[PDB]
Amino acid sequence: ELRVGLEESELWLRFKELTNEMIVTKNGRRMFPVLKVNVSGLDPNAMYSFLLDFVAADNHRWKYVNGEWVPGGKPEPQAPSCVYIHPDSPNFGAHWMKAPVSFSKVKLTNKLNGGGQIMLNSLHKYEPRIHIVRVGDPQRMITSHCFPETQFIAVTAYQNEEITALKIKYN
């Protein structure tokens, strides 16, 4: 059976309990934690590409008021559907399965200023999603997995001082 498991799920859960936040900048910012997954049940002999995108979680924005995240207004029009291709792509099933697959170099931005960056709307909530694409497939089979533990609000600056502190503590 194809199985895609989140690595360091207990680290992500320490951020999610505070409500996780990721900085977006003009030039783009790497994530912490990094999204890493373990993969089993690919065909070791087949070639696959791994893609990452971010799904908008809500029909509204968020705001941090009196130490709580609350609904903050109507949303901005959806960010364009940016996809990040894992740099090891395309590669053998055996490659993807022999060690966790790390998205350590993806950058999150709030300006379409290119460079394979992912544009997000500040004060909107997003859920990472990985796609596995089989190479040379006339059916163009894709598999998609979501990672609820990794939901976060995109911000231009940390709102929750407990998140600022945790980002330093574990990084």
Q: Beta partners for 145?
A: 130
Site for ligand O1M in 132-171 (CB under 6 A): 170
Report the C-alpha gap between 2 and 144 in whole angstroms. Answer: 11
* By CB under 6 A, residue 56 contacts ligand O1M: no
Of 1, 4, 8, 31, which one interacts with ligand O1M (CB under 6 A)? 8
Site residues for ligand O1M, 12-41, by CB under 6 A, read 14
CB of 134 to ligand O1M, least distance (A): 31
For the chain, how are helix, strand and coil distributed in percent, rounded to 5? 15, 40, 45
Alpha-carbon gap, residue 148 to 40, rounded angstroms: 20
User: Which CB sits closer to ligand O1M, 8 or 127?
Assistant: 8
Contact 128, 56 (CB under 8 A): no
Min dist CB 100 to ligand O1M, Å, is 11
- How many Cα neighbours within 13 Å face the side chain of 98? 8
Q: How far is the CB of 127 from ligand O1M (least distance, A)?
A: 20
When asked if residue 10 is in the footprint of ligand O1M (CB under 6 A), the reply is: yes
Task: Kindly tell me which residue out of 11, 18, 56, 82 binds ligand O1M, with binding defined by CB under 6 A.
Answer: 11
Q: How many residues bind ligand O1M (CB under 6 A)?
A: 5
> How would you class 4 by CB atoms within 10 Å of its CB: exposed for 0-12, middle for 13-18, buried for 19 or more?
buried
In the complex, the residues that contact ligand O1M under the rule CB under 6 A are: 8, 10-11, 14, 170
